[PDB]
Amino acid sequence: SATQLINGRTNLSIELEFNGTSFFLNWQNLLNVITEPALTELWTSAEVAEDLRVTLKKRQSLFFPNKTVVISGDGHRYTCEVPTSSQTYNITKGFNYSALPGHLGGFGINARLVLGDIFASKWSLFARDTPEYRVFYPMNVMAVKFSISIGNNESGVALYGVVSEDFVVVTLHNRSKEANETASHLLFGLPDSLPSLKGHATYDELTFARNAKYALVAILPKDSYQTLLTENYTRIFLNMTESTPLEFTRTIQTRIVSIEARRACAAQEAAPDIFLVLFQMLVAHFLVARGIAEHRFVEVDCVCRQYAELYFLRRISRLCMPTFTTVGYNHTTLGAVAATQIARVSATKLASLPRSSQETVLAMVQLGARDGAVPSSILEGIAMVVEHMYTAYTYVYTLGDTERKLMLDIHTVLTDSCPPKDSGVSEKLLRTYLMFTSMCTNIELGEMIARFSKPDSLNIYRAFSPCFLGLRYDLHPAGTSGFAELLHALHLDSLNLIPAINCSKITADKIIATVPLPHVTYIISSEALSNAVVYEVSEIFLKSAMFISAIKPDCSGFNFSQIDRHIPIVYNISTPRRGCPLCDSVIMSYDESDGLQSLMYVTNERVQTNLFLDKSPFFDNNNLHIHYLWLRDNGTVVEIRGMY
Amino acid sequence: EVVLLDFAAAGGELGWLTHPYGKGWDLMQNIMNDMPIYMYSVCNVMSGDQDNWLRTNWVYRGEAERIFIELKFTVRDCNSFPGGASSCKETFNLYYAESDLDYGTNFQKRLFTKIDTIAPDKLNVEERSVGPLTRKGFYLAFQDIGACVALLSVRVYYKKCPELLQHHHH
Amino acid sequence: DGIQYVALPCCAIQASAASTLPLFFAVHSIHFADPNHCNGVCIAKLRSKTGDITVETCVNGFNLRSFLVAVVRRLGSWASQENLRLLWYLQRSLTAYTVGFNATTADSSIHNVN
Ligand SMILES: *[C@@H]1O[C@H](CO[C@@H]2O[C@@H](C)[C@@H](O)[C@@H](O)[C@@H]2O)[C@@H](O[C@@H]2O[C@H](CO)[C@@H](O)[C@H](O)[C@H]2NC(C)=O)[C@H](O)[C@H]1NC(C)=O
Ligand SMILES: *[C@@H]1O[C@H](CO)[C@@H](O[C@@H]2O[C@H](CO)[C@@H](O)[C@H](O)[C@H]2NC(C)=O)[C@H](O)[C@H]1NC(C)=O
Ligand SMILES: *[C@@H]1O[C@H](CO)[C@@H](O[C@@H]2O[C@H](CO)[C@@H](O)[C@H](O)[C@H]2NC(C)=O)[C@H](O)[C@H]1NC(C)=O
Ligand SMILES: *[C@@H]1O[C@H](CO)[C@@H](O)[C@H](O)[C@H]1NC(C)=O
Ligand SMILES: *[C@@H]1O[C@H](CO)[C@@H](O)[C@H](O)[C@H]1NC(C)=O
Ligand SMILES: *[C@@H]1O[C@H](CO)[C@@H](O)[C@H](O)[C@H]1NC(C)=O
Ligand SMILES: *[C@@H]1O[C@H](CO)[C@@H](O)[C@H](O)[C@H]1NC(C)=O
Ligand SMILES: *[C@@H]1O[C@H](CO)[C@@H](O)[C@H](O)[C@H]1NC(C)=O
Ligand SMILES: *[C@@H]1O[C@H](CO)[C@@H](O)[C@H](O)[C@H]1NC(C)=O
């Protein structure tokens, strides 16, 4: 009907009768500044004709803290400014991406473009027919939205939140097969920028803790989860604000591992426990994004490595709770800056970088790899970094903390990647998978199995085993953590298809390991295959069955005459020095009773000369219960029995 | 009691004359007990000279000899505002004039005679009495000297003594 | 000249105004009350214009004050300095109306003189 025809006046007088003062609001100033249809929603949502009997009952349902616990202030600065020896770049629509120095992101970039890419989606929050409509006026914010749902089709719990550059909201709505529409809300951010409350509550009554910048509000009813009302929020506010950025990303990590320790990932009973972890995760994103706004320019290296910390927390939660969803961020600026910083890093020039520089490079590949953009110059570069890491591994047969973190960053890159187009690149990637299998020895199995059996002190940044990228399958033993199987499944799902896997009748439950040698693939399984030759283990008591089926990637057959399935024996080991005949071959060790022990791929001549050592999985002299098979590129299998 | 004029029983349909035009009395529709209750009022108590008049409609006399005026109204105190009773009062005058034909929009504030100053006793209600009536009809006017008064109901009637009873049971 | 006062600062919230509430663009004045006078209940009053008739509607002071708080907070930098004093008043007038505020000061029918 009428939109402006209802008011011909100019002011909106507000008379204070018993003080003699009056305020005014210009009607035009309210129409072309606040959206005209948004004012009518603000008026209808207010419910100004609501009887005071109801508003009192609303305050009698909420839970108010005793008093605010305001603390010294300013917490820990979630900041990383470009260093004093800076090189800043005021980037605009000029598209000067070819004029950026180096390949490690040691330069600066404006924060207004980074924040514009973090919060790049309008979300109509606090709308009607939602449990947030009772406490918050409807608002439209540009921010990132998080959401989790756990429960059956009868009863459920809805965890969903939003991370803005001024505040973060989380909700604990109760989805039951009846009507109980009372949710628990947690707030964090600038006190003067928090979403405006309804008429029956104020922030001074509900703020639990405050520092010089941020506050902590919790709008929860008196009949909410008992673990929420009897919770020390002042302690949570301190561990979030005064902790270093790395302490926060590791404390939240141990929380998710503790939730995974018990079978509470999909249990709606421990919903407030997840609700608190989701709140801490959303604060971690807020503090990082907030610290970016506190500077004119930011360093590309820090932001790309701070994103990787948050991206690891989001992907480690999605494995525990598959309904975990994050929407809203479109990193188009940093995605374009790293596109030029990576093009300078050749495959041969990537393995030359040290551990820290390789971390910076791989931290930038993740921005393009989360959809999958890995160029061939990096995939071949990862092949050399692992090859150098594997050749040096054969000296000590141990992996340090700095090496396991590298394999974790490589894991978060190859798992999030489309299969390579060039067939020559795919063959070099299968060599790395066969190399991680080589470092996945029997010593490493029990090492990571026992390490993943202690979820209290579990640190995946320091507990990542090379088996999670290997092609070995007998990792399951058959309250312990399950991320060992979840991280490995991420690599087995997004795995480049084995070339000879489509030539037989393979059943992927009776499979121990897959060895994709060049133009031949051995399959250690429990049942023989149908395509090509099969080698059977002659052990009497094996507690299992071992059949080494050798397939050709072209579904073809071999030229040598296969009469039976007996494995010949060559005795005299001579530590081959005559031009590496063990090259492109895999030596196999198996216990004559407890199945396999270890596989090792021999690529370099140094790896060869290192297999004949103590503290190695092969060629132990007195230990006769373990045999040593030689799976070679011949397509033939032979047993190595020299000293013994 | 034969009621000649009742304002509350009309239901907002009865409109009166407000002199002058800009300021003065205004018909206001308030809702009390889930039912609309109309009223004339004015609360211009911070200015100086204000002869705010409010003339009623034509009331046919018929047989009215002595009329009684009932006034249902509310008055707001003066010490509530920070004014210290500069031009704020708690009373208002009541006038009355006669006419044989409905003047309509004509209102001369010289033919009216001041009856009495209406003082409060907070629904302050007082009743007046004047007479006798001579012409075929009459008007009624309310004057505000600068008070904050909300006039809700006005009742005009004359009292009739019923038939006397004979002691022999007729 | 200045603030023009209203005859009845008090009113009573009827359970019919929710059905016949005037929209925002029809309210003439927003006359408030005091935490000491008008029985100390949080109550506001709106004025309208329905055919040359000044329609007065009783309105919850809590919800109406929080409404104006959101209107000024929506302005942000475009808000005037006098608008910030409007937000200043509503900030302490709400926290002063919320203190106490038991079922005694929630009975709005005290001022329902009918
Ligand atoms: C309440 O009103 C006072 C002033 O009232 C003034 O005096 C009355 C008689 C009436 O004429 C009003 O219209 C006047 O505005 C406000 O305060 C004063 O503000 C001036 C600056 O403008 C300052 O110098 C004085 O110290 C103030 N006086 C006091 C007592 O504080 C006051 O702000 C009003 N209250 C609110 C909440 O708005
Ligand atoms: C980065 O460069 C831009 C422009 O290249 C700067 O922005 C504007 O410059 C014009 C001058 O033509 C001024 O009128 C505007 O006020 C500037 N905008 C702002 C927001 O200041 C911008 O200031 C530069 N950034 C820094 C940190 O120096
Ligand atoms: C809730 O946690 C807080 C820590 O944030 C506990 O308090 C502190 O206690 C020390 C005494 O050892 C005081 O010096 C600090 O000032 C307290 N913290 C603050 C923020 O003031 C508090 O005791 C805990 N409460 C409960 C019930 O467990
Ligand atoms: C609105 O207020 C200003 C002063 O703040 C006043 O000059 C103006 O006349 C008012 N508008 C109307 C329509 O009276
Ligand atoms: C949600 O439902 C659970 C299970 O019925 C209950 O324990 C909890 O108190 C409910 N929370 C709220 C806020 O209603
Ligand atoms: C936060 O809590 C974790 C355990 O939950 C603890 O290891 C860490 O030291 C705490 N941080 C601070 C700053 O208290
Ligand atoms: C991100 O923004 C670019 C514009 O630079 C657009 O082309 C692209 O589709 C956006 N991505 C998403 C997921 O919306
Ligand atoms: C293949 O088998 C022959 C024996 O017929 C052996 O001499 C040769 O070394 C084997 N190939 C490799 C790569 O070891
Ligand atoms: C509760 O109501 C009584 C009225 O009987 C009042 O005197 C008292 O002040 C109220 N409580 C508070 C905390 O104001």
Residue numbers in the entry:
A (entry chain B): 36 to 513, 533 to 698
B (entry chain A): 28 to 148, 162 to 210
C (entry chain C): 17 to 130
Question: Which lines from the publication concern this structure?
Answer:
However, the receptor for EBV entry into the epithelial cells remained unknown until recently, when the ephrin receptor tyrosine kinase A2 (EphA2) was shown to bind to gHgL independent of gp42. Similar to EBV gHgL, KSHV gHgL also binds to EphA2, to enter endothelial cells. Here we report the crystal structures of EphA2 LBD bound to KSHV gHgL and EphA2 LBD bound to EBV gHgL. The overall structure of KSHV gHgL is similar to that of EBV gHgL. Both KSHV gHgL and EBV gHgL bind the channel and peripheral regions of LBD of EphA2 mainly via gL.
